[model samples]
Target: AMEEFTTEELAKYNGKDGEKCYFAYKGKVYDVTESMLWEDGDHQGMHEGGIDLTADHEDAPHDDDVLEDFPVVGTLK
Candidate 1:
């Protein structure tokens, strides 16, 4: 089963200083630490890690398919 993380818990993985980069979308949290698009918890200088991106993604130039390449580590609580 996947882990469930509260907003506070999710903030812990902000991809800062070798930390894992994680962000939530539509209730699910994805790990983007290994993604080249995400460096130092920053995504194209538009988005940040360790927070929910469901609302922000709607205005994103890309679609949900972009998130498929990453791993779903947990769900937002």
Candidate 2:
């Protein structure tokens, strides 16, 4: 269950941990694990290419967690 994010909602996409991550659809912010997209290198930072390795999932697949990050806020759903 993927969710859309408002500009205010996107404020959550910051910091290294706790509850923050790059969005799948751009501008939007998702809570994908910081480790999900990168592997300790600037070149290996969060991006579509890393997720593509998951044959079971698409690199840019939507995430329901985006909504969970801000439970009170609305979502793409």
Candidate 3:
């Protein structure tokens, strides 16, 4: 079964100080600590962790397929 995380719970993992990084897209959370694109927890300098990007993603040039690059770590509870 997949782990479930509330906003506050997931917020704990936001990349900072070499912490494990996680971001939420739609209702799911993904760990991107190992992804070079997300180095320093910022995605192309447009986004950082500790927030949901579901609304922002639609206007983005890329699609949701990019989320698949990282492992799904949890979902919003």
Candidate 4:
């Protein structure tokens, strides 16, 4: 079974101060800590980790497929 995270709980993994980087998309939470693009939990200065990114995808230059490179760690509740 996958872990379930509420928005408040997800905020703990914001990649700040040595924390892991995680972001939610379409109800799924992904771990992007190893991703260079997501270094320091910031994405190209356009986005941040530990938050829901589903709405932001529509404005992103790339498609959602890019997230496939990362691992799905849990679900956003």
Candidate 5:
């Protein structure tokens, strides 16, 4: 079965204190813990980890192709 997570459980992995980092976009959860850009989970201070970024990313200068660099770890349950 594919991994799934609740919103409450998602916050625990905030790319901090040894926890793996996770975030959602388009209903998919991604593991970005290893990305240097996601270090400390701030996303350049414009966004944070463990939250659905679908709406927030719409205005980004880039596109969803950026998500391909990360692995899809799960989805929101």
Candidate 6:
């Protein structure tokens, strides 16, 4: 459930705080918050919130260490 919108369209909300964004995937409504990563993680501790959705980003002390072959999920869903 990946949808891409132009930045201009996003401009509609320029300085528009508290705008709500969401996605429908597999029957789940994910709140795409900027403070959180959009993509699923390999495990826990890979991205912000340290709760990996993919199951490979897990590692307590390894919180948010995006490196070598590991890309950080920093976009809104």
Q: Report the number of the highest-TM-score candidate.
A: 4
Position 14, candidate 2: lDDT: 44
Record all residue pairs in model 5 with backbone atoms less than 3 Å apart, i.e. clashing. none
Q: List the residue pairs that clash in candidate 3.
A: none
Listed in order, each prediction's TM-score against the native is 0.93, 0.31, 0.85, 0.95, 0.91, 0.22
Number of clashes in every candidate structure? 0, 1, 0, 0, 0, 10
lDDT for every model? 0.90, 0.36, 0.81, 0.93, 0.87, 0.31
Q: Please report the candidate that would top lDDT against the real structure.
A: 4
* Candidate 4 lDDT score relative to the true structure: 0.93
Model 6, span 8-57: residue lDDT tens: 43333221244443322222223343423333311233332222233433
lDDT of 1 by residue, 1-77 (tens): 18999999999898898789999998999999999888899887888899998999999998899988888988999
TM-score of 4: 0.95
- CA lDDT of 30 in candidate 2? 37
Q: Candidate 3, after superposition: displacement of residue 52 in Å?
A: 1.4
Better of 3 and 6 by lDDT: 3
Candidate 5 least-lDDT 10 residues: 1-10
Model 5 scores a TM of: 0.91
TM-score of 6: 0.22
Q: In model 4, which regions exceed 4 Å deviation?
A: none
Model 1 scores a C-alpha lDDT of: 0.90
Tens digits of lDDT, candidate 2, 1-77:
35565545554554334544433332323334445333221114443311112232244356544335432222321
Model 4 scores worst on lDDT over the 10 consecutive residues at 1-10
Instruction: Candidate 2: list runs displaced more than 4 Å.
Output: 2-4, 15-17, 26-30, 34-36, 39-77
C-alpha RMSD for every candidate: 1.0, 8.6, 1.5, 1.0, 1.3, 11.9
Residue 59 of model 1 has an lDDT of: 94
